[PDB]
Amino acid sequence: EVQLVQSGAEVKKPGASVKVSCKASGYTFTDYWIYWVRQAPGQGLEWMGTIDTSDHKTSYNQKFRGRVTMTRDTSTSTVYMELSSLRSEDTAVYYCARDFIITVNYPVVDYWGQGTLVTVSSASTKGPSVFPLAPSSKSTSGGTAALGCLVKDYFPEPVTVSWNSGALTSGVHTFPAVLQSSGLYSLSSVVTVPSSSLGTQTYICNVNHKPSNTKVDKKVEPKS
């Protein structure tokens, strides 16, 4: 089986460098070039460059101005991409991909790594504060109400959120995080429930921010 396996997520300060690995297996490493593409959150695709795994020839996107260096180790079938002098706008998922030659006798068989998230920020690791999005006390015999929790001011990504230890899943919406002007992330998770049982059913949002080893369970209920 062909596999391209990349190194794990990175968090870096501006000015530092990052070196991402792309480990190839299941085919003849020196028979295919490898190239790299990145994608900033919510944005499109940007080609970074390519490397010949046989003789170390390279070509790069000159927009990176010599900050990108691609290398390869035949002893370990690994390609590396180093991006130097990092800036906040380099925050992106970085992908390696096996190149292809369009003039082959057979259909191209396409293979990609799983991607590596690189976060570039001056922010420090911080666990979130978790605040209730409280439902209206207003109840009806068969109406519904929304409630949720606001998971605010954490760094870096990611956080996970479940409800009632995973027992409550249908109608849960956990929104994509937004990056605030402070450099800290915030998101909300909500769920729709019957309004008639808000006083007797317990709704708990389970928040886990592994980078800060923060685990919080927050009960959400009508105010006053």
């Binding site: 499109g44 992908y95 909500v190």
Partner: protein, 212 residues
């Protein structure tokens, strides 16, 4: 430095219909590649050198075009085909991608279910107030959320977040969060979120009075 312009930005169709996606290059290229991308996944090559199917790609995908104008056609759409599609040229360095076309599922109009949430007393102690307006399970994606504080229109102090199109009911959900200092928050009374959407015959306003 060859610019690839894709159109339309979003394409809304139902399963079984036929999708036509366009890619226009700013100068001529010898061929065009096409990639598919689903949320949380790497891009996947579908068509190479304008018309050739990558290994394992089903025959309902076909590509055509020449010069500066290329097309990806997807017949009898399956649910697995709704995704973002990127064209790529490799005729001139640096290789460049189009900005992408989102192919999303068309369904009947669904009005949002709208809720407003005041800041918690716990957060207020910390010196900030977040007010949240929630729009649940609506279609189409287009929606306007307007914040007013004592009838003053708020600009620049809210952020919106939207879910991916739901795999089961094909709807979107949206949160808009208005952030104020505690100082600013305690100076005003009426907090209101007004939602405009095709499924609402007139805009829906949810509001509360601070301290009530």
């Amino acid at each position: 430095q060859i610019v690839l312009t894709q159109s339309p930005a979003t394409l809304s169709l139902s399963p079984g219909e036929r999708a036509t996606l366009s890619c226009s290059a700013g100068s001529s290229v010898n061929y065009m590649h096409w990639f598919q991308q689903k949320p949380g996944q790497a891009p996947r090559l579908l068509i190479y050198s304008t018309s050739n199917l990558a290994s394992g790609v089903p025959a309902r995908f076909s590509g055509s075009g020449s010069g500066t104008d290329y097309t990806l056609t997807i017949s009898s759409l399956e649910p697995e085909d709704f995704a973002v599609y990127y064209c790529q040229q490799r005729s001139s360095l640096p290789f460049t991608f189009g900005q992408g076309t989102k192919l999303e599922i068309k369904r009947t109009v669904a009005a949002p279910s709208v809720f407003i949430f005041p800041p918690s007393d716990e957060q207020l102690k910390s010196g900030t107030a977040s007010v949240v307006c929630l729009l649940n399970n609506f279609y189409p994606r287009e929606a306007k959320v307007q914040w007013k504080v004592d009838n003053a229109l708020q600009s620049g102090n809210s952020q919106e977040s939207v879910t991916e199109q739901d795999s089961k009911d094909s709807t979107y959900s949206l949160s808009s969060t208005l952030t104020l200092s505690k100082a600013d928050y305690e100076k005003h009374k009426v907090y209101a979120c007004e939602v405009t959407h095709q499924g609402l015959s007139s805009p829906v306003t949810k509001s509360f009075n601070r301290g009530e």
